[PDB]
Amino acid sequence: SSKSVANIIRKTIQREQNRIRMLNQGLQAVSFGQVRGVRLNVNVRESHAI
Amino acid sequence: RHFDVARILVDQAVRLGVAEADFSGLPAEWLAINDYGAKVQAHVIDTY
Amino acid sequence: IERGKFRSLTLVNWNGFFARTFDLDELVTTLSGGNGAGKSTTMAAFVTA
Ligand SMILES: Nc1ncnc2c1ncn2[C@@H]1O[C@H](COP(=O)(O)OP(=O)(O)OP(=O)(O)O)[C@@H](O)[C@H]1O
Ligand SMILES: [Mg+2]
């Protein structure tokens, strides 16, 4: 059961990472002050990967 | 109208290069630019 | 009588300000500039001093 759990979490995390990474390209370098672009960083947490 | 001119002119001038003296540590003086007591503080704009 | 006055504010080697002195007015000083110009930085200078 624990193995199946870990597997389903890994698959869901990968799917969500892919979705968000595809979505990130929906931004076109907004110009606000010295901010030239906005982006979303999605990364699996090593503290949780272990 | 003088004020409404000064501002605008400065807005137009500061987009054109920088002033090299601003890194010298020597403050600029308040040069009078008219009667009635109007003054301006800016180094010469050299590096375009 | 004759209230003391802050005459000047100096910033040295700060982000955007290597060496900048502002001559504080006796009544009103108004910083003006676009977003990110660094006005909050100047008031930060005053307070931290
Ligand atoms: N601690 C900091 N670390 C990194 N960058 C900073 C820091 N503080 C300010 N900045 C940057 O310095 C620039 C000036 O910031 P600041 O907030 O002083 O601007 P401002 O013109 O006073 O802002 P506003 O008019 O919107 O109140 C901006 O690019 C800001 O991102
Ligand atoms: Mg600010």
Write the layout of secondary structure elements.
This is part of a larger assembly, with two copies of chain A and one copy of chain B (48 residues).
Chain A: H1 2-24, H2 46-49
Chain B: H1 2-14, E1 30-34, E2 38-41
Antiparallel strand pairs in B: 1-2
The complex binds adenosine-5'-triphosphate and magnesium ion.
Organism (chain A): Photorhabdus thracensis
Subcellular location (chain A): Cytoplasm, Nucleoid
Protein name (chain A): Chromosome partition protein MukB
Q: Greatest interface and its residue counts?
A: B-C, 6 and 5 residues
- Total count of strands of chain B: 2
Task: Give the assembly state of these chains.
Answer: part of a larger assembly
Radius of gyration of chain B: 12 Å
Bound molecules: adenosine-5'-triphosphate, magnesium ion
Helix count of chain A equals 2
The percentage helix of chain A is: 40-55%
Percent of residues in β-strands of chain B? 15-25%
The proportion of strand residues of chain A reads under 5%
Q: Helix-strand pattern of chain A, N to C?
A: HH
Distance between termini of chain B? 29 Å
Shape of chain A: elongated
Total beta-strand segments of chain A: 0
How far the N terminus sits from the C terminus of chain A, by CA atoms, comes to 18 Å
Structural class of chain B: alpha+beta
PDB class: dna binding protein
Keywords: SMC-kleisin complex, ATPase, DNA binding protein
Entry title: Cryo-EM structure of the MukBEF-MatP-DNA monomer (closed conformation)
Chains A, C: Chromosome partition protein MukB
